[PDB]
Each structure stands twice: as C-alpha cells, then as structure tokens.
Design a protein around this ligand. Structure first.
Ligand SMILES: [Cl-]
Ligand SMILES: [Cl-]
Ligand SMILES: [Cl-]
Ligand SMILES: [Cl-]
Ligand SMILES: [Cl-]
Ligand SMILES: [Cl-]
Ligand SMILES: [Cl-]
Ligand SMILES: [Cl-]
Ligand SMILES: [Cl-]
Ligand SMILES: [Cl-]
Ligand SMILES: [K+]
Ligand SMILES: [K+]
Ligand SMILES: [K+]
Ligand SMILES: [K+]
Ligand SMILES: [K+]
Lengths: 186, 186, 186, 186, 186, 186, 186, 163, 186, 163
C-alpha cells in the first residue's frame, strides 16, 4: 500500500460551498487532510458515505482536519448534485473533480476498466505522509466514526513521540511506551 | 490498492494450536479469509491487535471466516511468542511465518528498508477476491469490531448480488438497491 | 484525420428515454450513425448543441440515422441532466457515458489535459466508415442544418456510385460524373 | 483532432494572381487563415469547392481572413490549372503546392496510400491556433457559407472573452456567459 | 548504384493515348523497359527530353522496348499536360503518375526535400535486371540517341553471351570475346 | 543516386605518368573531376573505355577537367598494365588503386560479391558536387563523346545560374530560362 | 569464496548485554571481527555453537576480537531468546538482527528460498579483509577452539609478514620462511 | 557459499600412486569425497597441509572417504613433485591437475589475478552434496584432525537425521 | 593463432598452368595443402619466396602437397604477372585471386587499412586442420626448405600417433614416445 | 595474425640463473626479444626445443637478443625443472611463469580447452613490433637455426630498409 508515503503534487477544480475553487497539494501542507474517494456522482452508496462525513465535518474542522471528496466526475457535476440532493446539500467541504484521473492515479486508486475511483479513504498528516488507508468493495459502505477514531490516534501519536496507541484506543486511554523492558511482556 | 483483485498463490509454514503446518492458497479456496499482517513478534502494538482478533475468533469461525496472522518472523518465533505472552497464548488461528517476505509482497505490504510487513488487514472471499483493506501507520492500532462489520457487509453483498450496504450499515439495517430511479434521489 | 477509416469496436452504457442501455459497434452495423461529442454535462454551449440535434431528430430517424451523443461523464449524470434541464429532457436519442475515455480515444478526440472530449461530430455509414468530420473550439457551437446537408450528400454518394456531390449540394441539384473527358473541363 | 493546437512551421511555393511566391508560418502571424486542402488539380469536386471559396473571398478579405488552398501538386500545376479552367481562373488567393506532403502532414491530412491530401479545412487564428476543422469524403463537397459562419463565431469569441457562441450563432444573436449560476440552468 | 539489380514490384496509374491505365511490374516481365524519371509536369527541360524520347518511340517499339515516363505528378496532370503542350501531345508511351513517391523510391531516385524525382533513366531487361543507368543534374538535359545506343548494346550482349560490346560500340561493329588468351593483349 | 551530393574524403595511391602519387579529395577542390570506375586491370571492355577517355584528355584538360580512373587493383598493377598495353600506355591521367574498396564504397559502386567496382562514371564540380552519373552493365562499353557533352552542359549551367540545357544541348544551341511564363508553353 | 575480500558497509540493530545498539562497518574498523551466521532463533536444537563462542568470548576479547552473531530474525527476537534460554543467556557479544537480509547477502550467505542465513563463520582483520571462512551443514558442529586457533594464526601472520603458518600450526611451533631455496625442499 | 549444493561435472587428469588417471564426477558417486585445493606445487604451506592429509589417509579410507588434492598445475608437475619431495612422496590419494581452472571455478575457488586456487577444502557426500567448506588465507595452514572430526560428524548426521 | 583449427569454406578463381580454374575447400579434402599468402603482384621486389616454393614444387607434389598462393589481386593479374616475370613463370601451382578478401579473412590474415594480405604460410592436413604457421615482415625471407621439413614432420606425426618430433627433427632421426616414465627425464 | 603489432604490457615472475625476477614490457624496450611459448614443464618436445634455444643463447646474446621462454606453469615449477633435468639445467635465459594466461593471451596463444600455451615463437624488435611469428602443432618441434636466420634477416632489414 501507499502507507507511510508522501502525497504527490496535484491541481484540480472543486466545488466548495457555492463556489468553484482550485485545490493543489499546497493547500494540504501544514494541515491534516482526508482524501475521500468514491466512484460516481448521482449513485447510491456514495451519497450516504459523503453525508456521514458531512455529519462529522464540524468536529473534523475543530481538530484541524480538512476533507476532500474525489471522483472522476467534474466540479460542474458536483454542483448539480449538491443542488439536487438533500444529503449532498449538507456538504461544506471541497468536492474535487478528477476527470483526467490524475489525482486518483496518484493514490493508485483507479478502476482502470470503469474510469471510476474505488472506495478508498486516505488520512494525510501535515508533512504529507499517509497514516491511515481504508478501501472497501463497491457494495460495502465506510463508517465515519472509525475514521474519526483513527484521525485522533494519528494526531495523538504525532504529538506524543515515544508512545503508540494500542488496538481499540480512544481519547483518554492507556498508551504503550516502546522500550527494551516492554519486549515480550504484553 | 489490491481491492477486487485475486490473491496470489503462496506456501508458508505456520504455528496453529500447538502444531506446525503448511498453509497455501488452496486452503483459502471456498472460504472467507482474513490476512492480518503486522511488523514483528515480541513488540508492543502487535499483541493488542492480535489478542483483540482472538476475542472475536469464535464469532468469525461461526461466520465461516479463517484468520491468518502474518509477519516476516518464522513459525518458530510465533510458537515461542505464543508460549511466553498471555495475550498471544489465546490465539487459536494460524500464525504464518513469512521469512522470505513472499506472502507480504503478494499483498504489496513490505517495508523494504525494514524487512517487516506494514499493519495491513485484507478480507478475502471464497473466490479469492479481496473485498476490504485496512492499513495503519506504525503507532495506530486496528479495531476488530470494525473488521467484523466489514466481513458481515461483505457476506451480505455476496449473498444479495443486486443490493449494496450504505455507510454505517449493520446486520438488519436498510440496504440500497442500485437502479435508474434511485439516481440522485438519496 | 479519421476520414474514410473504420470505427473501432466499443462497449459503453447510455441513457435513452428513461432507460439505461448498453451500446456497442454491433448496434451501428447496417445503420447510419452520428457520434456527437461534447465536453461536459451541466455546462453552457453543450445543451444548446444537443437541443439543436434533438430538434432535427425526427428527420434523422426518417433517413435511417441514429444519434449517439458522447461525453466523459457517466450515464447516471446524463439521466440526472435529462431530469434537470428542459433542453436536455427533449433528447430522445442515446446519451452515451464514456468515463474510461475509450470511445473518445477511438475517435482521437480526447483533451488529454482535461479528461473531456472536444466538440466533434462524426458521420458513420452502415459499413462503419467515417464520411464526415466537424470539430469546433470550446466556445463555438455547431449547427445541425450543416450536419443534415452533409448526411444527405453522404447518402446520395453511397446510393449512386460513379457520381460525386459538388460544393453546396442539396437534394435535386446537379452532380458530377468523374471521368477522363471531364479532367480540367470544369 | 488538431483542434486548439498551434500550426507547425512550413515553407512552400505557391501561385497567386499571375506570380509565384513563397508562403511560410511567418506570413500567417497576426492574421486569420483558412487552409483549404483538396486531393488533386484537374479533377471534379475540387474546382467547385475552390470556386465557392473564391466567391466568398471579398467577404473574407474584409474580415482580415487569408485563404491558402493546398494540394500535393506543384505550384507549376496550379498556374496551368488557373490558365486552363474558368472556375480556377477566378481564384485571387494563394494556391500552395505541397509535393513533399509536409504541409499536409503538419495537419495530419495525408491519404498515405494515395499521396493526396483529404478534403479538410482549418480555421487558424492570429496566434496560430486552430479554431475549427471540417473533413468530408472524396465525393462530398464542402460549403463556404458554413466556413464563414464558423469564422465569424471564431472572431466573436476572440473579441469577447468571457462569452461563448451557442449552436446556430449568427451576428446579432444571443450569447452565453459561462458561470457557476448558469451550471445546469439551460 | 542499382546496376545489375532486379526492379521492385509497383502499382501505379498512368495516362496512355487518351486513356487511364494501371501499370505494375507484371507489364514489364518479358519486355525491355525504359523508366524515364523527371521532376515535374508543366516545367522546362522535362518536356524537351520527353519529346526526344517520343521521336525514338517508333524505333524503340520495333526493338521490343517499352517506355514509362515517371514523375510525382498525378495521371490527371499528365493528361492536362498532354492536351495543352504540342511536345507532350506527341507522346504515345505511358506517362506514370507517382504521387506516393513509391516507384521513385524503388529506384532510389527521390529528391526528398522537393518531393520530385531526379533526372534519371533506367534500362530494364526482360528478367527485370537494370542494365544501364543515366542521372543528370536539374539543368542538364539527357540525349535519346545515346540511350538508343545503350539499349542496342544491352540487347546485343543478351543475345550473344560470351561476347561484350567495347567502348563506342554501334550496330555492325567488332565485339570482344573474353578469354584467357585475350588477357593483357588489348 | 548520389546526384547532387558532395564527394566524401579519400586518400589513395595512384600511378600517373611514370610516378606514384597520393590523391585525396583536397586535390579535387576548385576543379572539375571525372571519377571513371571499372572492374579490373588486364581485362577486355575496360581498356577500350580508358583509351577512349585518353583520346579526349587534351580537350578535358583545356576545359579545366581532371580524370581519375579507379579500380580495386593496386597502383602497382596499373603501372604494369600501362607498360604492357598500347592502349593503357596512352593514359596521362591518374590511375587510382583502391584495394581497400573505400573510394568505390564512397561512390556506392562496389560489386560486394566480386570485390570489383561497377562501370560507373561521375562528373564532380569544383565544389565537390556530383552533376552527372552514368553506370552500365559488365558488357556495355561507355562513350566519352557523351561524357564530354555532359561536362560542357554542366560547365554552362554553373556559369549561367538562371539557365538550363534542354535535351540534345550542344555548345551554342538554344538554352531555356525557367520562369512563370514558360510553364506549359513548350 | 569471499576469502581475501573486503567487507561491505552495513547498518543493523542488535541486542547486546541487555541493551539495543546500532552496529555498522565503522564499528569493525581497526579490530578483529567474527561474523557468526546461523539460520534462526527459537528452533528446537540447543544452540551449542553460539554457547561455545560465548564460553571462549573472554579469550577472544583479550585477543582484540569482537563477535557478531547474525540471523535474519529481529533484535527483539534475540532479546527474547536471550531471556528464555540458559545457553543464549551466556552471550555477552552483539546479536545482530538482519530482517532485510542485507548483511547476510553481503557475505553471500542467504538461503533465498528460506529467507534464512547459512551456518557460516567469517574472520575479518583490522583492515576489513576476510582471512578465514567455515561453512557447515546442520549437525556438523562449528568448534570455537578451532576458530581461536585460526584467529591466532591470522594474527601471527599479520604481525610477521615474510612468515607463513604451516598445517596444524599453534603458538610456539615453527613457521616457514617463503624463499627460493625452500622451493621443493619440504 | 556453495554449502548444500551438488558438485558440478568435471574431467581432469591426475597423478596417483605412480600412474596417470582420469577423475570425473562419476568417480565420486556413492563415496564421501574431500576436494582439497591449494595454490601451487613446489611451495611451502601446501606440502605441510598435503602431508598432514596423507598422515590421515589410511583412516579416511577406513571411513569410506576419498581425497582429491587440486591445484592449477598439471598432473605432470604433481608427478615431479611426488618424486622430489619427501612430504609429497607420502601421498597415496589422487593429485588432480587443473590448468584450465575449470574444476577450481566449479567450486568458485580461483584467485583470478594469480591463476591459482585458494586454500579451500570441500567435504562432499555420496549424493554429491557439499556438507562442509573451509577456506583460509595464503598464510594459514589447515588442520586435518578438524577435517576428520567434521567428516565424522557429517557421516553421523547422514546416518541419524534429527538427533 | 589459428593453429589446430579447421579451414573454412571458400570459392575462388585462380590462374594455374595457362588456364583459369575454380578452387574450393572441397579441392583440399583428403590432401595436404599449403596456403601461401603475399601482399601484391607486380611490386618492385623480386618474388623469391614464390619462386623458391616453385623450385620445391615437384618434391611437394611427390609428398601429396598442393600449393595455393594467395593475394587480393585478381586471377587476371596473376596471369599477366606470370607472363611478365621469369620467377613467376616457373610457378606451376594454383595462383588464387582473392579480390573480396574472403579467403584472406578466413585465415585472419588481412591488413584492413591496405586491402592486402600479410606474408603468412599455413600448412593444412587432409582433414582440414592447420598444423604449421609462419608469418614474417617484409625482407624476412620464408625459406621453402624449412617449409618442407615442417610438412615432413607433420606427415610423420600423422602416420605415427603416439610419437612426437623433437626440436630439429629430420627423417631418420630419433623421436620421443610421450609416457609417464619420460616425465622430467629429458 | 599479430604480425607488425606492438607487444602489450605485461608483468610476470620468472626464474633466471638461480634467482626469481620480475619481467615486464619495460625490460624488452631497446632490445630484440624472442618470446618462446611451449605447453608444459616436465614433458617431451618442450625440453628439446628449449635446449636447442639454450645451445644458441650465447650467439643470440652476441646479436643483442634476449630470450623469454613462456608456459602457463609457475616460476616455482620452472626452478624445479631447471634443477631436475640436464637439458633445462643448460638454460641461462629467463623462464617466465604465466599461470593467469595473461601473457599467453596477449599473444593470442592459449589452447583454451587445455590451459596451456601453443608452440609459438614471436620475434620482437627494439620498438616492441612483432617481426616474425612461427606456430607448430603439438607434435612438431621448432628449429633454432631457422629462428637465428630469421632474426639476422630482421636485423638486416631494420638497419638497411629497402635493399
Ligand atoms: Cl494504497
Ligand atoms: Cl492494497
Ligand atoms: Cl479526426
Ligand atoms: Cl485534425
Ligand atoms: Cl542507381
Ligand atoms: Cl549513384
Ligand atoms: Cl564465501
Ligand atoms: Cl563456497
Ligand atoms: Cl594465425
Ligand atoms: Cl598470431
Ligand atoms: K525475518
Ligand atoms: K469522468
Ligand atoms: K505530387
Ligand atoms: K584488389
Ligand atoms: K597452470
């Protein structure tokens, strides 16, 4: 996988809160970023996942986390979808259009026989390093609550070097501090 | 990612419930499989994740799912770890040794500069197709309850071809049926 | 240019009169076809051109000519645009979705830096041979009265071998008979 | 197609109003140009098309548009054809000779098995960018009224940036202003 | 040079005595053939040479010799030239058109920067073997009388194996009969 | 052919009027040169052609023309031939030896399966440009009176850049002046 | 073999006397070193060979010899092995972990189908040159007292250039002085 | 290293007990073999090492073990050395000549800048598998008692796998 | 050198006792042959070496040895040389002409910068194997009596396998019998 | 062949008059040299040929000519052969050892399937140019009187070019 690799440069048009904007890797530098890939606008599993991310967007913003949804549809289609669907209408984050497929291919996430992105989510730190990846099949929906758990653990580990978050770790729980002494004890 | 691709052939030695055995791709044919990769035996986050999977192993076996944990350590080391850790001692699934790194590379999961596998989990169906992938960075532990939810959704979609599981789908909740009429109405 | 070349095989999904269908080269065998490329759904020049073709569609169906509009948007987007716009709602011909860009690339008509097709029209005969090409710039709209004239002249030449349509040919006007005696006489 | 590409440099001899001249890309800098390709001197469809362009030549010179007809015959042959035919004797524009096929190949317009150019027309702006393309089959003649309409729309779009000519645009008719508010409103 | 090599296959259109015909290498098999290349129709040195060949054509035919003049002009241009020039009007041999340049390139005789053939003449025997080559610069005219001398010597040598025609040989003169005895005597 | 190409550098030993000398391309700079190739010393057609050239050598020297006869034999063999043949004894021009075949290959005149040069003659001007080429088969002797006519025409055209020598042109006869008016009037 | 070659650079982690350290080729500069390779930790066989080197380690350190045992297991596994086994607990020299196989491949000692090192011992001098090598199959014991003898002989020849140690040489025994008069004398 | 690999085919001339013989890999089949490489005849460490192996040859032959000494010199040179040196005169095993260096290179044991073999000993089982390898520097002689101990260990593990 | 290699196939013309013949490797089968190379005919030096082989030619033929002298000159030149020189006139063996250099290159005996063979002699046995070679610079005479001695020794060893001819061996002298007991005895 | 080419640089050990020396191409500069190749020490044609060159060495040294015998054996082997054979004991010129075959291959004179040099003699002038080459089959001995005659001829043409 692309775990522990730096994101590549990109330049794309996006729809964000009634305006068209340009997004590049420079917008991600010094921020926490979620790249939320999905196959197509005006489809079925796709809106439900985007709406669930929209429900956590206020908290994600409080934690310094930007969200970028991405599909191979244009930014024009994203606006039409935002205006016609009550689930998409609640999106306040940038909806990137990747019709060249370049951003999708930067993340090795193209379904090359369909020209659509796979259901992949990537957590990117302020240095551009990918810290968490989740990929699901066409029919399996992703859950924003587990993404939030992971973002919080990735933020804790960044702030507490020398510590690690064990399995099932949540805010305000015991962390392991790797040492020679701890080797073979757990 | 390797999403919706077929697993590659392999032949590895494993430690399983007090004995050494060979595991190959033919042992996965006709069953649901979890390939759970981790970097090293006798470390820190690794046992909490493996123990957490062992706590759900009776439910996974009730669902027809086999677990294979994998690291680049040998099956001898897995056995020793199983005898010295209270957490590893509760594993009743196969602990695969991948000292050549071939199983890890099949899954494109090697840290080549370390000779250790990344913290990657793959859900593979009875036809050898990868249906869900999760990868986390060195200090971020995985959560088996999310793994189980994804296996159940993967089992549902395989059992109901014309249906899809939306975001946050749990057993019994409202599914979606992709069609011309559902386009843009969610 | 691709003039007097055979169309390449293709398999694409499309929206046509409230139903999703599959279109291939096999569906064009034995018929006259108009492949009407345009850059993107939900834009400005594209619907006016698509409406202009729709206006001349009864006349085209009487002449045995099938219309296939094409863009790199999906068929789901075409269905949504059909429901959203009164101009597009009057289209009774097949709206092909080409998210892979393959059908666009068969006609060497991709804007490779944009992932959008250019404004190009191809007249294709019952034997798969391109008999007329028209490409205009992003801001210049095409005119169906030109397309129909060229279509009728294409139909005359095929139904009358040994004759050729001179400049400004309309039904009932004089035609040339290529021969040795006529060389340099016009 | 070559739409929205820059013309390549060239150096060809030509016949123009009783004199032989050299034409290069430098002669088209700062002017609007029509490259009118045709297969061969002393044929049948070619003079009728060339005569039709000659008829609209005063109107083209008023709009700052230069005409350059092209074939793989030499300039000596164009001079002889000018003297031989009453249709060709009325041509006041430059008749380029392209025996090397280089100018034809710059426009990807060679019939490689015949050594003759196809019936293609290119509208080129003062900056060397192709704004309109028309290719017809050996027996189908082109119509200059179409060329002039496309030329006028090309001139409008360049002289009015931020506007676009919709389908069937004539001088005095309404134009669209691409914006976010207009996305999916037409 | 191409001396003593077999001619290559070719297929070209030609003007011959008021008709258009196809010429291939099969027309040359079992005959003596002269391939008379020249740069362009409607030029200056070119007609004078072709007319001088036309003056010897009756005798050439009496000797079983066919003539094929060749330029990169079309067979249509050859007809126009035949009708408009009193020198070309006297040509009774085939005037081949080589607009693809293929026949010219078979004989390594293209001026690649001009797309015109050089002033080259080739004498080909009934087995397709090139027995005499003459090439001159753009401004130097060829003389049919020396070509006739050469054809007659090539025919004599073919009929009298074991003999050779020395320098300046003409019909009814002494020939050398190569032998060991003759070595060093002349 | 090598018509209108520049001669390549060479360095060869020669026999000339009782002495051995080196001849290079620098010895041709500023003069008219005849490279007269033949297959072998002590043979049959070769001496008649060489003797015939020697009979015109005073006129050629009066015209500023140097003669170089060439074969793949050595300069030693040329000297011996010159001492034993009454015909070769009258040669006062350089007899070049080309045992390596390099001078012959420069002129693309080697029979590779024999190690002998073909019966080829090249006329080279003071700038090293080949202006006339003649090649004949093994048994067909060349005629020096035709060679002289071609040198004179080559000298005239070099001395009168805007003029050309038509077919059968001799010193003093009517020349042609290429222009727009002369096109198709001969 | 690698006899008389220089060791290659390396950088590995190790377990040494209760602490984790980094070892590189720079730690070997100016010292005598022993690289002691073995297939795997935690196997069922008693590690007598490693224990036997530990029994001789005080004497080796008196002779300025550093010991590095190497396997493809991690330094975490070595520490666990050291805590679990009485034989391994005697080890006071560095236990290098080589999970990438890179130190093992530098000594051309990898079993590529297993991902384990062979049972090879290399004696390295202060300039990095390999002076002795021993490789045995499983069950063929490597004797540490034969290793000490070899090291002592290597140290003797380094301190007495011009002398060589014959078969069975030990401190106090006679050496040979390579000379011309000694040729064929033993 | 070449540990646990099968020896490669070879064909060489040798001197043995006053006669010249040909030795190939077919002569090693079903026998335990010692390929004992050394750099050059008429030198110094080489005879002491070869003499030490000759002192243990009777014992090695009691263990079913054949010995082949190998250098890049010819079998002609080995015969001369056997007649002129008292140490070499004790050798009753085959002295293989390897002037092409082919046998030396099969064992990857050539000092390519000298055209001489390195001081390497290979223990080879009845199936052609290399079970023990020892290589020492130019100045360090090998010990035949250590070679015998390893050979006895190799035979024990062959007879009793897993103990 | 080419010692103990087999001769390669060849096909050359030759001068032999007033007639021209063809020589191939098949003419050498079953015979002893001498290939006697030399740079050139007709040079100023007296050809003593060829004359000396001619003085010994009756004896060589009695010994079943055929002689072929070879130079890169033609067989025509050899015949002329044979008529002009008293030394060469004594030659009754075949004088091979090698103008392609192919027989000379088979014996790796070409001076590539000269196109002449070196002064090399090769003795070839009835199976085509080269048994003796002698190469000298100019002025270092090749002695035919040393050539006879060498041939006699080669014939002796062919007829007495198991015997070798020592230094200075001649018919009647003692030979050596390669054996173990003879090792170090001479 | 290598006729009229310059000899290539080399560095080899040799036995000469009871001592071991190093010979390189720098030792041949400004001297006439004979490189005399033979297949193997302790054999048959080789000593008769080497002994015949030894019989003419005093004369060759009077002509300013140095002799270097070369085989793929070591300089150690040449010393042993010089002590054990009465024929070799007469040699006062350098016996070069060529175990890497590098000097043999510079003269393109290796029997690659034997690792032995062919019976080739090269006459080399003071500028390093090869002026005469002679090669004979395994069973045919060379004649030193013919080598001397050619050397005298080479010296005459060097001193008097064009006669
Ligand atoms: Cl990934
Ligand atoms: Cl993946
Ligand atoms: Cl096109
Ligand atoms: Cl185009
Ligand atoms: Cl040619
Ligand atoms: Cl040519
Ligand atoms: Cl090694
Ligand atoms: Cl090894
Ligand atoms: Cl040779
Ligand atoms: Cl040679
Ligand atoms: K490992
Ligand atoms: K798209
Ligand atoms: K043309
Ligand atoms: K020659
Ligand atoms: K050797």
């Amino acid at each position: 996988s692309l775990i522990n690799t730096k994101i590549k440069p990109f330049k794309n048009q996006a729809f964000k809160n009634g305006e068209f904007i340009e997004v590049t890797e420079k917008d991600t530098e010094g921020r926490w970023s979620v790249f939320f890939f999905y196959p197509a606008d005006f489809t079925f599993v796709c809106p439900t996942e985007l709406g669930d991310v929209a429900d956590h967007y206020e908290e994600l913003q409080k934690l310094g986390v930007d969200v970028y949804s991405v599909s191979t549809d244009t930014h024009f289609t994203h606006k039409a979808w935002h205006s016609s669907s009550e689930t998409i209408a609640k999106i306040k984050y940038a909806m990137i259009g990747d019709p060249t497929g370049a951003l999708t291919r930067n993340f090795d996430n193209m379904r090359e026989d369909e020209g659509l992105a796979d259901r992949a989510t990537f957590v990117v730190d302020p240095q551009g390093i990918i810290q968490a990846i989740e990929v699901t099949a066409e029919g399996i929906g992703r859950d924003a609550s587990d993404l939030l758990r992971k973002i919080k653990a990735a933020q804790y580990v960044a702030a507490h070097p020398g510590e690690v978050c064990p399995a099932k770790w949540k805010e305000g729980e015991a962390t392991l501090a790797p040492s020679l002494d701890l080797v073979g004890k757990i």
